[PDB]
Short mmCIF file of all heavy atoms in Angstrom, two decimals:
data_model
loop_
_atom_site.label_atom_id
_atom_site.label_comp_id
_atom_site.label_asym_id
_atom_site.label_seq_id
_atom_site.Cartn_x
_atom_site.Cartn_y
_atom_site.Cartn_z
N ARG A 21 3.47 22.43 -14.42
CA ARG A 21 3.77 23.35 -13.34
C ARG A 21 2.54 23.50 -12.48
O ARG A 21 1.45 23.78 -12.99
CB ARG A 21 4.21 24.72 -13.87
CG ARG A 21 4.98 25.57 -12.84
CD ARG A 21 4.91 27.05 -13.13
NE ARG A 21 5.64 27.41 -14.35
CZ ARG A 21 5.06 27.71 -15.51
NH1 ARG A 21 3.73 27.71 -15.62
NH2 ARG A 21 5.80 28.01 -16.58
N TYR A 22 2.72 23.26 -11.17
CA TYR A 22 1.64 23.36 -10.19
C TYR A 22 2.22 24.00 -8.93
O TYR A 22 3.23 23.52 -8.42
CB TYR A 22 1.05 21.98 -9.88
CG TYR A 22 -0.35 22.06 -9.31
CD1 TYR A 22 -1.44 22.33 -10.12
CD2 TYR A 22 -0.57 21.96 -7.94
CE1 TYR A 22 -2.71 22.46 -9.59
CE2 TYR A 22 -1.84 22.09 -7.40
CZ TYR A 22 -2.91 22.35 -8.23
OH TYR A 22 -4.19 22.44 -7.71
N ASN A 23 1.61 25.12 -8.48
CA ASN A 23 2.06 25.89 -7.31
C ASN A 23 3.46 26.42 -7.52
O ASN A 23 4.29 26.35 -6.61
CB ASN A 23 1.94 25.07 -6.00
CG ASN A 23 0.52 24.84 -5.55
OD1 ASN A 23 0.14 23.76 -5.08
ND2 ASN A 23 -0.30 25.88 -5.66
N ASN A 24 3.74 26.93 -8.73
CA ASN A 24 5.04 27.51 -9.11
C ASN A 24 6.20 26.55 -8.95
O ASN A 24 7.33 26.97 -8.66
CB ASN A 24 5.31 28.82 -8.40
CG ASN A 24 5.82 29.87 -9.33
OD1 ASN A 24 5.08 30.76 -9.78
ND2 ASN A 24 7.10 29.78 -9.67
N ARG A 25 5.94 25.27 -9.13
CA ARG A 25 6.94 24.23 -9.04
C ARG A 25 6.83 23.41 -10.33
O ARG A 25 5.75 22.93 -10.67
CB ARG A 25 6.70 23.37 -7.80
CG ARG A 25 7.91 22.57 -7.37
CD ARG A 25 9.03 23.43 -6.83
NE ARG A 25 10.09 22.61 -6.25
CZ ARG A 25 11.14 22.14 -6.92
NH1 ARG A 25 11.28 22.41 -8.21
NH2 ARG A 25 12.04 21.38 -6.31
N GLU A 26 7.93 23.33 -11.08
CA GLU A 26 7.97 22.63 -12.35
C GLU A 26 8.25 21.14 -12.16
O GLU A 26 9.19 20.74 -11.47
CB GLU A 26 9.03 23.25 -13.29
CG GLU A 26 9.12 22.58 -14.65
CD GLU A 26 10.20 23.10 -15.58
OE1 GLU A 26 10.84 24.12 -15.24
OE2 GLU A 26 10.41 22.48 -16.65
N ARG A 27 7.43 20.33 -12.83
CA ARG A 27 7.53 18.88 -12.85
C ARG A 27 8.07 18.45 -14.22
O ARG A 27 7.58 18.91 -15.26
CB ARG A 27 6.14 18.29 -12.61
CG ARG A 27 5.54 18.74 -11.28
CD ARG A 27 4.03 18.70 -11.33
NE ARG A 27 3.43 18.81 -10.00
CZ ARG A 27 2.64 17.90 -9.45
NH1 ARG A 27 2.36 16.78 -10.11
NH2 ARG A 27 2.11 18.10 -8.25
N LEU A 28 9.08 17.57 -14.24
CA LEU A 28 9.64 17.06 -15.48
C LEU A 28 8.73 15.99 -16.12
O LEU A 28 7.83 15.44 -15.45
CB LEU A 28 11.06 16.53 -15.27
CG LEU A 28 12.14 17.57 -14.98
CD1 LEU A 28 13.49 16.92 -14.84
CD2 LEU A 28 12.21 18.61 -16.06
N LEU A 29 8.93 15.72 -17.41
CA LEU A 29 8.12 14.75 -18.12
C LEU A 29 8.88 13.46 -18.35
O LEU A 29 10.11 13.46 -18.48
CB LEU A 29 7.63 15.30 -19.46
CG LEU A 29 6.72 16.52 -19.41
CD1 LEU A 29 6.29 16.90 -20.82
CD2 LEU A 29 5.49 16.27 -18.54
N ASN A 30 8.15 12.35 -18.43
CA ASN A 30 8.77 11.04 -18.66
C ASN A 30 8.02 10.25 -19.75
O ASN A 30 8.63 9.43 -20.45
CB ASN A 30 8.85 10.23 -17.36
CG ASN A 30 7.53 10.09 -16.64
OD1 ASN A 30 6.58 9.48 -17.14
ND2 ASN A 30 7.44 10.65 -15.45
N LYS A 31 6.70 10.47 -19.87
CA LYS A 31 5.89 9.77 -20.86
C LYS A 31 6.23 10.24 -22.27
O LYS A 31 6.35 11.44 -22.52
CB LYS A 31 4.38 10.00 -20.61
CG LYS A 31 3.91 9.59 -19.21
CD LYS A 31 3.62 10.81 -18.30
CE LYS A 31 3.22 10.36 -16.90
NZ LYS A 31 2.95 11.51 -15.99
N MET A 32 6.40 9.29 -23.19
CA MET A 32 6.68 9.60 -24.58
C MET A 32 5.36 9.67 -25.31
O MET A 32 4.58 8.73 -25.24
CB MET A 32 7.58 8.55 -25.23
CG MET A 32 9.02 8.80 -24.98
SD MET A 32 10.07 7.70 -25.93
CE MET A 32 9.73 8.22 -27.54
N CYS A 33 5.11 10.79 -25.98
CA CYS A 33 3.88 10.96 -26.75
C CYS A 33 4.05 12.05 -27.80
O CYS A 33 5.04 12.79 -27.79
CB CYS A 33 2.68 11.22 -25.83
SG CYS A 33 2.73 12.81 -24.96
N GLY A 34 3.09 12.14 -28.71
CA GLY A 34 3.13 13.10 -29.80
C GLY A 34 3.19 12.40 -31.14
O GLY A 34 2.72 11.28 -31.30
N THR A 35 3.76 13.08 -32.13
CA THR A 35 3.90 12.57 -33.48
C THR A 35 5.38 12.68 -33.83
O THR A 35 5.98 13.74 -33.65
CB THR A 35 2.92 13.31 -34.40
OG1 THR A 35 1.58 13.06 -33.96
CG2 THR A 35 3.05 12.89 -35.83
N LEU A 36 5.98 11.57 -34.25
CA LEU A 36 7.41 11.42 -34.54
C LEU A 36 8.06 12.57 -35.37
O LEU A 36 9.10 13.07 -34.92
CB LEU A 36 7.73 10.05 -35.15
CG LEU A 36 7.84 8.92 -34.12
CD1 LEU A 36 7.98 7.59 -34.80
CD2 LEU A 36 9.01 9.14 -33.17
N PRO A 37 7.50 13.05 -36.51
CA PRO A 37 8.15 14.16 -37.22
C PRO A 37 8.15 15.51 -36.47
O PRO A 37 8.92 16.41 -36.80
CB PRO A 37 7.38 14.24 -38.55
CG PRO A 37 6.52 13.05 -38.61
CD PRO A 37 6.28 12.61 -37.22
N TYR A 38 7.34 15.63 -35.40
CA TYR A 38 7.24 16.85 -34.64
C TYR A 38 7.87 16.80 -33.25
O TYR A 38 7.99 17.85 -32.63
CB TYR A 38 5.77 17.25 -34.50
CG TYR A 38 5.12 17.57 -35.82
CD1 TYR A 38 4.53 16.58 -36.58
CD2 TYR A 38 5.05 18.87 -36.29
CE1 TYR A 38 3.94 16.86 -37.80
CE2 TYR A 38 4.48 19.17 -37.52
CZ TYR A 38 3.91 18.16 -38.27
OH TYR A 38 3.34 18.44 -39.48
N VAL A 39 8.23 15.59 -32.74
CA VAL A 39 8.79 15.51 -31.39
C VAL A 39 10.22 15.98 -31.31
O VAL A 39 10.98 15.85 -32.26
CB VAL A 39 8.65 14.13 -30.69
CG1 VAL A 39 7.30 13.96 -30.01
CG2 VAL A 39 8.97 12.98 -31.62
N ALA A 40 10.59 16.51 -30.14
CA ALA A 40 11.93 17.00 -29.86
C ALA A 40 12.88 15.81 -29.64
O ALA A 40 12.45 14.73 -29.22
CB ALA A 40 11.89 17.89 -28.64
N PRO A 41 14.17 15.96 -29.99
CA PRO A 41 15.10 14.83 -29.85
C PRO A 41 15.26 14.29 -28.42
O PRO A 41 15.33 13.08 -28.24
CB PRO A 41 16.41 15.36 -30.44
CG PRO A 41 16.28 16.83 -30.38
CD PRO A 41 14.85 17.16 -30.51
N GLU A 42 15.26 15.17 -27.40
CA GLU A 42 15.37 14.78 -25.99
C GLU A 42 14.26 13.83 -25.53
O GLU A 42 14.45 13.08 -24.58
CB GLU A 42 15.37 16.02 -25.09
CG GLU A 42 14.04 16.77 -25.05
CD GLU A 42 13.98 18.02 -25.91
OE1 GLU A 42 14.81 18.13 -26.83
OE2 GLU A 42 13.11 18.88 -25.65
N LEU A 43 13.11 13.86 -26.19
CA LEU A 43 11.99 13.00 -25.85
C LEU A 43 12.31 11.52 -26.09
O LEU A 43 11.84 10.65 -25.36
CB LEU A 43 10.75 13.47 -26.62
CG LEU A 43 9.45 12.82 -26.26
CD1 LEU A 43 8.37 13.86 -26.11
CD2 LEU A 43 9.06 11.80 -27.30
N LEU A 44 13.15 11.23 -27.08
CA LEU A 44 13.54 9.85 -27.40
C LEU A 44 14.91 9.46 -26.80
O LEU A 44 15.26 8.28 -26.83
CB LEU A 44 13.58 9.61 -28.93
CG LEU A 44 12.82 10.56 -29.86
CD1 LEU A 44 13.64 10.86 -31.12
CD2 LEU A 44 11.43 10.03 -30.21
N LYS A 45 15.70 10.43 -26.32
CA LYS A 45 17.04 10.15 -25.82
C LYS A 45 17.21 10.30 -24.30
O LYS A 45 18.22 9.85 -23.76
CB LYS A 45 18.06 11.05 -26.53
CG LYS A 45 18.01 10.93 -28.05
CD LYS A 45 18.81 12.03 -28.74
CE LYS A 45 18.43 12.14 -30.19
NZ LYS A 45 19.22 13.19 -30.89
N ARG A 46 16.26 10.94 -23.62
CA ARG A 46 16.38 11.17 -22.19
C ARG A 46 15.21 10.62 -21.41
O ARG A 46 14.09 10.60 -21.91
CB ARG A 46 16.57 12.67 -21.92
CG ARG A 46 17.97 13.17 -22.29
CD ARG A 46 17.99 14.63 -22.70
NE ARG A 46 17.36 15.50 -21.71
CZ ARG A 46 17.84 16.68 -21.32
NH1 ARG A 46 18.99 17.13 -21.83
NH2 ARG A 46 17.20 17.40 -20.42
N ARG A 47 15.48 10.16 -20.17
CA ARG A 47 14.44 9.60 -19.30
C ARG A 47 13.51 10.69 -18.77
O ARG A 47 12.31 10.46 -18.60
CB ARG A 47 15.07 8.80 -18.16
CG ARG A 47 14.12 7.76 -17.57
CD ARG A 47 14.84 6.76 -16.66
NE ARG A 47 14.93 7.24 -15.28
CZ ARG A 47 14.54 6.53 -14.22
NH1 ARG A 47 14.03 5.31 -14.37
NH2 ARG A 47 14.66 7.04 -13.00
N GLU A 48 14.06 11.88 -18.50
CA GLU A 48 13.28 13.02 -18.03
C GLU A 48 13.66 14.28 -18.78
O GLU A 48 14.83 14.50 -19.08
CB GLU A 48 13.34 13.18 -16.52
CG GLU A 48 12.13 12.57 -15.85
CD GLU A 48 12.09 12.70 -14.34
OE1 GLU A 48 13.15 12.97 -13.74
OE2 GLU A 48 10.99 12.52 -13.76
N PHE A 49 12.66 15.09 -19.12
CA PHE A 49 12.88 16.29 -19.92
C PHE A 49 11.87 17.39 -19.61
O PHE A 49 10.73 17.08 -19.24
CB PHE A 49 12.83 15.92 -21.43
CG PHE A 49 11.69 15.03 -21.83
CD1 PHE A 49 10.50 15.56 -22.30
CD2 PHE A 49 11.79 13.65 -21.75
CE1 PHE A 49 9.45 14.74 -22.67
CE2 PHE A 49 10.73 12.83 -22.10
CZ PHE A 49 9.57 13.38 -22.56
#
């Protein structure tokens, strides 16, 4: 979020047992 405008995410990162399901199933989240 920059200047009260939310930007969606596309890069996959983190650790597999802790990541949310949408991170592996959706292009933007």
Side-chain angles (χ1 to χ4, degrees):
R21 199 204 292 105
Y22 201 77
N23 290 139
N24 226 100
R25 199 69 171 90
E26 181 184 352
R27 302 154 166 240
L28 291 182
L29 297 182
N30 54 64
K31 304 106 183 179
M32 275 188 66
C33 67
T35 298
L36 279 173
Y38 296 88
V39 276
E42 68 259 20
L43 188 134
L44 341 140
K45 305 168 196 181
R46 286 151 52 138
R47 203 167 88 128
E48 262 181 342
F49 46 94

